[PDB]
Amino acid sequence: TLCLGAITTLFTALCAITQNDIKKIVAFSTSSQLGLMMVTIGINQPHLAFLHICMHAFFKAMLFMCSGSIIHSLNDEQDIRKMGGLYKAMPFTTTALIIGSLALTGMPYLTGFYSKDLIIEAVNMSYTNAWALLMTLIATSLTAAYSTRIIFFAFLGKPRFPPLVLINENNPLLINSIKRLLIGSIFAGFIISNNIPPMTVPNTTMPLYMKMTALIVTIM
Amino acid sequence: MNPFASLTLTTLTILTIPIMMSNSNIYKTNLYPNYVKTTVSYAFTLSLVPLLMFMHTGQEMIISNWHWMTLQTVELSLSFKMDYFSVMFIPVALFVTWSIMEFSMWYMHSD
Amino acid sequence: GAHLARRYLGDASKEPDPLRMPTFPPDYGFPERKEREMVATQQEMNDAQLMLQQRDYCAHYLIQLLKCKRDSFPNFLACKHEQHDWDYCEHLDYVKRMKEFERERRLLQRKKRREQREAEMARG
Amino acid sequence: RHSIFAVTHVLIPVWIIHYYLKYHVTAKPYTVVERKPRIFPGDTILETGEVIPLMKEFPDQH
Amino acid sequence: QQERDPWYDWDHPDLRLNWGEPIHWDLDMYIRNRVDTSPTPVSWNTMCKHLFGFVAFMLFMFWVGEIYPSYQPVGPKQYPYNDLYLERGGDPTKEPEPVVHYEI
Amino acid sequence: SDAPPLTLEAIKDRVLYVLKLYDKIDPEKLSVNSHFMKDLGLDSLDQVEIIMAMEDEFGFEIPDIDAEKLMCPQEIVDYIADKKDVYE
Amino acid sequence: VHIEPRYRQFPQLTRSQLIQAEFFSATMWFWILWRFWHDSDAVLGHFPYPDPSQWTDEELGILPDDE
Amino acid sequence: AFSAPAAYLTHQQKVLRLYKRALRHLESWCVHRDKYRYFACLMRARFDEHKNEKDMVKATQLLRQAEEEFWYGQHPQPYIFPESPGGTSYERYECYKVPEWCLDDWHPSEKAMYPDYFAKREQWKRLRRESWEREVKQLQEETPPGGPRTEALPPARKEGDLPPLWWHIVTRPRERPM
Amino acid sequence: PDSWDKDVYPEPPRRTPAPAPQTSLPNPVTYLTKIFDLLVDRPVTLAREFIEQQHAKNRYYYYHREFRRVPDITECEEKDILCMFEAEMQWRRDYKVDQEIVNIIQERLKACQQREGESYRQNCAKELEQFTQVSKAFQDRYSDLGAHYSARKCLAKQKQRMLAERKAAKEAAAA
Amino acid sequence: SFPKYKPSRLATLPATLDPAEYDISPETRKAQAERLAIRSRLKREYLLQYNDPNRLGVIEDPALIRWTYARSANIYPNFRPTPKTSLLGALFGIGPLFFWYYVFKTDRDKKEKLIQEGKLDQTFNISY
Amino acid sequence: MLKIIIPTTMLLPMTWMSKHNMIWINATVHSLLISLISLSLLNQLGENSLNFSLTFFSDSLSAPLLVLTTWLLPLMLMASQSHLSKETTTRKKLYITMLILLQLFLIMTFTATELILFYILFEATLVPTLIIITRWGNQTERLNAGLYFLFYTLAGSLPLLVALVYIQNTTGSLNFLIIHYWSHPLSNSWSNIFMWLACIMAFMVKMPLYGLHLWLPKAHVEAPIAGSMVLAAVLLKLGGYGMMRITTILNPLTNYMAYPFLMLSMWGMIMTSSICLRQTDLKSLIAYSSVSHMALVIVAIMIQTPWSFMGATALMIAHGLTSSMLFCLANTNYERVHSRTMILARGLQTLLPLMATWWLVASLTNLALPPSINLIGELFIITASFSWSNITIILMGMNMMITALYSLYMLITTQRGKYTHHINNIKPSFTRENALMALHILPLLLLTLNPKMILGPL
Numbered sequence A: 001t002l003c004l005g006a007i008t009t010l011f012t013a014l015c016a017i018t019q020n021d022i023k024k025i026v027a028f029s030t031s032s033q034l035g036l037m038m039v040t041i042g043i044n045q046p047h048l049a050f051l052h053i054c055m056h057a058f059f060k061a062m063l064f065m066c067s068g069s070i071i072h073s074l075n076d077e078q079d080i081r082k083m084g085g086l087y088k089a090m091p092f093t094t095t096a097l098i099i100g101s102l103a104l105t106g107m108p109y110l111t112g113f114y115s116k117d118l119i120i121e122a123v124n125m126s127y128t129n130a131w132a133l134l135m136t137l138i139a140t141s142l143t144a145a146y147s148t149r150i151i152f153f154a155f156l157g158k159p160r161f162p163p164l165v166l167i168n169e170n171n172p173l174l175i176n177s178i179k180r181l182l183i184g185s186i187f188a189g190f191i192i193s194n195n196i197p198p199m200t201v202p203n204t205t206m207p208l209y210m211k212m213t214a215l216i217v218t219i220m
Numbered sequence B: 001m002n003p004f005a006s007l008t009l010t011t012l013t014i015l016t017i018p019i020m021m022s023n024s025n026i027y028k029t030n031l032y033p034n035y036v037k038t039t040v041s042y043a044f045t046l047s048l049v050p051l052l053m054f055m056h057t058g059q060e061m062i063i064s065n066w067h068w069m070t071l072q073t074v075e076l077s078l079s080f081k082m083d084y085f086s087v088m089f090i091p092v093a094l095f096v097t098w099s100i101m102e103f104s105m106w107y108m109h110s111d
Numbered sequence C: 001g002a003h004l005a006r007r008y009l010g011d012a013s014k015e016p017d018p019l020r021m022p023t024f025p026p027d028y029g030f031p032e033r034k035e036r037e038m039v040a041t042q043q044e045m046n047d048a049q050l051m052l053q054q055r056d057y058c059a060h061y062l063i064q065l066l067k068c069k070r071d072s073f074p075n076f077l078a079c080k081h082e083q084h085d086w087d088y089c090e091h092l093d094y095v096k097r098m099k100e101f102e103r104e105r106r107l108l109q110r111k112k113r114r115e116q117r118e119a120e121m122a123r124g
Numbered sequence D: 001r002h003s004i005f006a007v008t009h010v011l012i013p014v015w016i017i018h019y020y021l022k023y024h025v026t027a028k029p030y031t032v033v034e035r036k037p038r039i040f041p042g043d044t045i046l047e048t049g050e051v052i053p054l055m056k057e058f059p060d061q062h
Numbered sequence E: 001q002q003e004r005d006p007w008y009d010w011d012h013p014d015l016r017l018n019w020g021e022p023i024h025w026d027l028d029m030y031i032r033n034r035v036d037t038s039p040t041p042v043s044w045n046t047m048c049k050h051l052f053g054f055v056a057f058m059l060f061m062f063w064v065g066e067i068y069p070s071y072q073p074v075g076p077k078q079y080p081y082n083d084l085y086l087e088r089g090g091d092p093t094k095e096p097e098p099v100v101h102y103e104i
Numbered sequence F: 001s002d003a004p005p006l007t008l009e010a011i012k013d014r015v016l017y018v019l020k021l022y023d024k025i026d027p028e029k030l031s032v033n034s035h036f037m038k039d040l041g042l043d044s045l046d047q048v049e050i051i052m053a054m055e056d057e058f059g060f061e062i063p064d065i066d067a068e069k070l071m072c073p074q075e076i077v078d079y080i081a082d083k084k085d086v087y088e
Numbered sequence G: 001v002h003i004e005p006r007y008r009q010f011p012q013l014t015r016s017q018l019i020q021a022e023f024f025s026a027t028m029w030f031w032i033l034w035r036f037w038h039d040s041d042a043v044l045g046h047f048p049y050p051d052p053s054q055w056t057d058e059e060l061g062i063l064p065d066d067e
Numbered sequence H: 001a002f003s004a005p006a007a008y009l010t011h012q013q014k015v016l017r018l019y020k021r022a023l024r025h026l027e028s029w030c031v032h033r034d035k036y037r038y039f040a041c042l043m044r045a046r047f048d049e050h051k052n053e054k055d056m057v058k059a060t061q062l063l064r065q066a067e068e069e070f071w072y073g074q075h076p077q078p079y080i081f082p083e084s085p086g087g088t089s090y091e092r093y094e095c096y097k098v099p100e101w102c103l104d105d106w107h108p109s110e111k112a113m114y115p116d117y118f119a120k121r122e123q124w125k126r127l128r129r130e131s132w133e134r135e136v137k138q139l140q141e142e143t144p145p146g147g148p149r150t151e152a153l154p155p156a157r158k159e160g161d162l163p164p165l166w167w168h169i170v171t172r173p174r175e176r177p178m
Numbered sequence I: 001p002d003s004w005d006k007d008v009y010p011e012p013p014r015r016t017p018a019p020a021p022q023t024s025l026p027n028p029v030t031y032l033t034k035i036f037d038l039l040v041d042r043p044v045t046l047a048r049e050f051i052e053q054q055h056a057k058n059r060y061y062y063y064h065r066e067f068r069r070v071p072d073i074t075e076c077e078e079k080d081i082l083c084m085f086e087a088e089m090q091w092r093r094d095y096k097v098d099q100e101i102v103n104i105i106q107e108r109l110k111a112c113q114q115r116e117g118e119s120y121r122q123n124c125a126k127e128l129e130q131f132t133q134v135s136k137a138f139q140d141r142y143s144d145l146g147a148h149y150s151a152r153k154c155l156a157k158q159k160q161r162m163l164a165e166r167k168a169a170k171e172a173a174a175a
Numbered sequence J: 001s002f003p004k005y006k007p008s009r010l011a012t013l014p015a016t017l018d019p020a021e022y023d024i025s026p027e028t029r030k031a032q033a034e035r036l037a038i039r040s041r042l043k044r045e046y047l048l049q050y051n052d053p054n055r056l057g058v059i060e061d062p063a064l065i066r067w068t069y070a071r072s073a074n075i076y077p078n079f080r081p082t083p084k085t086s087l088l089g090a091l092f093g094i095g096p097l098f099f100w101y102y103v104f105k106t107d108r109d110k111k112e113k114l115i116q117e118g119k120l121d122q123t124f125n126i127s128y
Numbered sequence K: 001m002l003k004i005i006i007p008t009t010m011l012l013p014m015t016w017m018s019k020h021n022m023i024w025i026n027a028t029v030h031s032l033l034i035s036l037i038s039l040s041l042l043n044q045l046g047e048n049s050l051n052f053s054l055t056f057f058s059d060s061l062s063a064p065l066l067v068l069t070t071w072l073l074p075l076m077l078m079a080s081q082s083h084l085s086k087e088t089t090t091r092k093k094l095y096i097t098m099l100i101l102l103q104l105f106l107i108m109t110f111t112a113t114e115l116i117l118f119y120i121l122f123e124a125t126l127v128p129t130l131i132i133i134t135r136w137g138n139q140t141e142r143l144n145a146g147l148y149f150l151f152y153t154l155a156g157s158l159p160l161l162v163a164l165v166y167i168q169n170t171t172g173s174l175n176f177l178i179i180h181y182w183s184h185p186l187s188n189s190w191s192n193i194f195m196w197l198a199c200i201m202a203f204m205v206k207m208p209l210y211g212l213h214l215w216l217p218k219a220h221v222e223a224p225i226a227g228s229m230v231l232a233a234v235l236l237k238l239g240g241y242g243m244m245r246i247t248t249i250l251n252p253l254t255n256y257m258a259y260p261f262l263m264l265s266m267w268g269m270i271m272t273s274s275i276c277l278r279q280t281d282l283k284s285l286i287a288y289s290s291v292s293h294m295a296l297v298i299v300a301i302m303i304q305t306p307w308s309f310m311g312a313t314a315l316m317i318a319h320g321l322t323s324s325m326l327f328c329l330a331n332t333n334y335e336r337v338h339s340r341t342m343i344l345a346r347g348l349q350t351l352l353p354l355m356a357t358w359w360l361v362a363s364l365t366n367l368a369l370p371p372s373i374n375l376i377g378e379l380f381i382i383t384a385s386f387s388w389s390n391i392t393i394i395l396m397g398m399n400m401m402i403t404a405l406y407s408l409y410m411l412i413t414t415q416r417g418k419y420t421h422h423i424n425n426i427k428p429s430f431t432r433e434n435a436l437m438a439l440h441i442l443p444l445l446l447l448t449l450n451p452k453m454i455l456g457p458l
């Protein structure tokens, strides 16, 4: 199970970094996170895997909804090469997508942190296959890489869509749904972590560099 | 009678009502998507209570309500496990489904 | 890790084997050793239904934390002293395991070197 | 007309489910099994009234 | 059928067939819901080599990492009551060999 | 809702707008009936570029066999209107 | 809310959408800063990791290379 | 899609099709507009460098080399318009397209709604019935004795004629039917 | 309740701890359970009371059917069809009763596993042992008869096992 | 100049990479004209019935009938027992049967031998 | 059980005395009433069978089969009256007479207490089926089909007859109760081997066994719709019922005489499922589906365990209903377009939505979606085979993958895609066809609600 999860997360994160359809990128991201869950199961931490399922649901659904908002605004266009500067033209969608990407990369104290960070630390401190550990670290770097690809190509720079501009996200249904999922993606990690009984023994003592491994690889 | 079991069963049961109404004069009108979305939101709000009970006392259950059939020594019954995994996953899935249904009310408006 | 590089590249003879550890008697080098005591009774751990893996030598702090969490239910931010105490106990347990590992490494290297030196003296 | 949704979609189904569970399902053994509540030192039992003693004089590594 | 021109006015647009023209023996295999023989950007026999090399390399590396595992410099975890002899399956009428842990 | 109901006047306006932004065509000398080769003195490569600019403007592709035949703005407008079921 | 197409210009923006986006970005950053100010140990680690080499043989119980 | 194909493509047609394909794939590689404009001008210069080659054999050799280079350097994932044969919305609305003859099978209660629409439909059907035989006769006259050689159809030429074989072209369902 | 025998389906004495509030905040669980009581448990109780009142006005009984014991297949002559028929029916009834005994034991095992929670590996030893014994006996009696089983095939199986056991005992005696 | 693309069965050669369409003859042009003439004749014959206002039903296609008949009824009359046909029939109709028979017989013999020795761990094996 | 037999014999003159324009109404009404009466046979015991008399008895294995037969007669009548509208009154009455005689023969076959009476009725079912196929089939191949249907059966059943009479000279009886109570083992001799083969091959060719199945695609494709319904739903189950009856006297020879048939069944199940993937005729696909499911049933009967017998019973009932429904669904399209080629009419979901829903439900039951009784039977058989040998899960597993594929393939070919442009004669579905589909499908799910009624005597 551990080796299957490691190869899955690495291969899917490696495929995701060159894709041009936004739905394909998010789907490969989902597959890579499922591989990480399989890795977590493989190191005998099922409750951490369940917590990661619960954490990932929020921001993954929000990211897909933001992609759908972009697609509907640009006349059902899904190629990121034809999406230009939506940072100012689509402010709320930009905010939601940025928060979702930060949560997906395990940025501290967001929803994705409370599961992914612990998963990486548990993988580091266990008697495990070394190649699986290396592929897990490379995959968690590639996660930030493809998140950067999505943000950079979809929201920064100059427009690349057809000149008849129909960009409009002012609709209460879209705003309310995304706002609910955004509140979840900000606070659910803390709320759920502080309200469950501890079913696992915490890794209290670790070398400082191995405590910062996830953050460092994400930054690189 | 310890409302845990009744609430856990009702959360799942009320989700099937629009399925039974799919042959009434609400499936032919433009109010059906809102009706389904409201049903899902109510289900989420109801399911929030067994989660609170578990977070308070760690209460867990199994409910074997209907006996379907029995082989010679193997008994097959409709049974539901209401442990931590179920009572944690149900509200999350219901919340996500509520948000996505409200989103679909706008995304698939021309369908 | 540096221990992995030492074992896999250097001389694996003087490196402790995690699966086969320890190889020396617990009272080999020490004159006398205190027996590691336990605070929680088997019945208390059974009643608390901790886990088969949480029933370590820090189980009493975990039991206290669980009781405090149940008593302070709506205030899910009130069990900070108990959680900190349990974390400190687990940290001391991990430090003790590290001490055992270092003791095994030093004993292995010293014993091998002493045996080799005695044989070398006997070889002249 | 306003709050009739909470009656026909929550209250009636919960009435039916509660009746079915209270008077039919639990009329047979081992149909609703709950794992036993956790017991901690210093607790008092509701039925017997028995109290559970404390925990062996903590070494107090303050 | 995927290789046929999609900008032509076929009598059957989904099948990309014209009425009356001879039908391939294996048409139902080639209906484009199915086996596709269309030209690829990268040569066949080069996709195969890369895919097989990647798969074999990952398998070999997983084996190597299994026989050179990774771990922390710690000793085994210690459990109080004779490695919890009664908890992991009972047998309370055998008096197992005592398991003793000492302070350090 | 969705995009507005494109009309013939809008299509013609956008086609002429694209054509007057082409540096090889004089704006004043351009009319809706001007031939690309005869009136304007352009070659086949310029026509291919014009067809591609139309495709970018309207967000859909014109097949090569159909695109070869279009020679004046009126033919382009008629082809776009026929493709998109525009009747007003 | 009626927003009309623009044709090669920046689209029309309502004040509410910018207000909502700015508010939620600000609240995410405030939560990050507050949770780091109160729970720094969750990132930087809580307990000092010891260096095994600085453990004397007296407490580790190895004899002085004689017996 | 609308024009009848010829028996073969000419050299100029092949050159123009290669030019369009190369520019599209270069745009797929060059995502940004200014970079694409620069490299597209370079590609146009490279194309018209050999525009005045009187030797046809050398021209076809150059075209062959250019196509080999294109196949080597093509984008594996080029941009496709969403409704183009490779796009994400290629045949999305085909399930909503219903042929007009289905309206003949509506129950009279269904036809009781929309009276004016069905009166107009009856007028169109009468026109088609009155025009069919003249269309067939015109096709019989204009066709060469050894059968037709292309798929091109003639227009109407007489006083009140209609172009032959017009019904299924004129009564297309729609591009967005429902 | 009194619907089932509590010795056939036993349960532990059900010790549950008393509430020990340590916070000034109110308990949402208690407030919600009071609302659930007043809004759900009372109307259902009244409906059940009405239904039971109606039932009490019409009280009638059904009985468990009693079967006497007939001669077994061992006491039947080789071709005596009637005695064989009665013995085969008795054997089939006994087979069904044995299946239900195994079912009762399995129910006990499953209930204990759910009840004991995290301590099930130690606290369900007795139920596991009972199931092991019953399963061994049932497997000895009825396994491998196949489809088209009968009392005669069961008797042949028992005779074969008895012969093997007698031979093993006599061979161990000679040791 | 550039690395060459070589076709395969499941990834065929592109038209623009085909040498046959870069060295052409007037015979090839005549053949293409004949092909287009045949296609145009078939297209006219189909379209004449397709646009017929008095036509109700299915426009029968002789090509579809020929395809289905060739795939179903024309096969046995055109079959000859040859070394290739006989060898392929024997292989693909007999070899799998004996392969699976050997596998299953070996597995069941091993299981039976284990059962005779009394070491198979058949505890809790009640249903079969 | 004359309370079921006599009303069918009364259906006969009631049909022949009816007014010319009331034959279908009267036949359907009284057929449905007879089915309602036969519903009472489901009250079975746990120890022995319902021994009505010296001649007829009802078990927990034959009662669902009788209910299926009596329920299938009205559905056949409903499906037949569309394409027989142009027929003369006398020929319509003759067709209904053939259907009634077939029902009577099947009813008496499933309840006969003696094996020779069972044999006589089980051969008597041949004549009405052959007459129906060769007289009311549409194409010229029907004649050949009839011949293939006849001799394939008889070449199997003539040896059985000999064996039967031989057995009666040895044991003195062919009564099934006496045969069961006075059972004796079969020794390992050549004579016993050939007796086993004579007792087994007729039922094997009836299932049919892979390699002996060539008659089935011909007969089930060339037959009229009612013929195909009764051939797939009931007549294939004669082999399984007869095998489960006859195996009580074949032990312990079966222990090793089943190997060639087990290998044939498993590999040919894979083979026929694969054949379904490349089929141009829609009816032939359904026929090969029947072959695969019957191979599963053969494996279940051959391994001789209680779980396998329960699975075999459930699978036979479920397959009967599902295959009859699929044949009716294909017949609707055939009557619309007069062609059996699958790719001729496409995109039918756009033109006929409710019929598309019926297609989806039928194909879902074909691939054994849980908790349908199709899945229950398949899973019981797979579990029993796993106990027989752990390697079987490979072949069975492959089958589960292939079935769904071809099943969905069929759906995707007929309902999805775009409609054929030149086909303009697709009329809206009639009330009769929708009612036929509903009367097929609703009993399947109702039986899922209470599965112990189709699980057999084990």
Ligand SMILES: CCCCCCCCCCCCCCCCC[C@@H](O)O[C@H](CO[C@H](O)CCCCCCCCCCCCCCC)COP(=O)(O)OCC[N+](C)(C)C
Pocket: K188, K189, K190, K193, K209, K210, K211, K212, K257, K260, K261
């Ligand atoms: C297309 C599909 C049609 C339906 C399929 C029907 C399947 C029928 C296959 C019959 C299965 C087995 C039949 C007899 C059992 C054993 C056969 C023999 O091969 O086994 C050995 C037999 O030994 C030798 O093989 C002798 C037999 C050799 C002669 C038989 C001819 C087989 C050649 C293949 C001809 C094809 C037959 C089918 C025609 C269609 C066992 O050794 P032995 O212990 O001593 O014999 C046991 C019987 N005893 C105890 C009384 C002595």
Ligand SMILES: CCCCCCCC/C=C/CCCCCCCC(=O)OC[C@H](COP(=O)(O)OCCN)OC(=O)CCCCCCC/C=C/CCCCCCCC
Pocket: A004, E033, E034, E035, K397, K398, K401, K405
């Ligand atoms: C367990 C026994 C079997 C295991 C599987 C072995 C291989 C099975 C081969 C299946 C053959 C089926 C033939 C008929 C299928 C229908 C035709 C079909 O599917 O069409 C092909 C269709 C079209 O291709 P697209 O890329 O989507 O292009 C469409 C856009 N233009 O694509 C498909 O669906 C092909 C799917 C076939 C998958 C076969 C390969 C899978 C092999 C799995 C092995 C790995 C095991 C994993 C182990 C996990 C660790 C425990």
Ligand SMILES: CCCCCCCCCCCC(=O)SCCNC(=O)CCNC(=O)[C@H](O)C(C)(C)COP(=O)(O)O
Pocket: F043, F044, F045, H011, H012, H013, H015, H016, H022, H025, H026, H046, H047, H048, H049, H050, H051, H052, H053, H059, H060, H062, H063, H066, H067, H069, H070, H071, H073, H074, H075
């Ligand atoms: C993505 C990267 C891959 C792309 C790489 C592509 C590399 C190819 C670049 C070089 C290819 C060439 O120049 S190939 C050079 C071919 N030269 C000739 O054929 C000379 C004869 N002239 C004509 O045929 C016409 O003038 C015509 C030119 C058609 C103009 O058409 P019009 O005037 O009537 O509009």
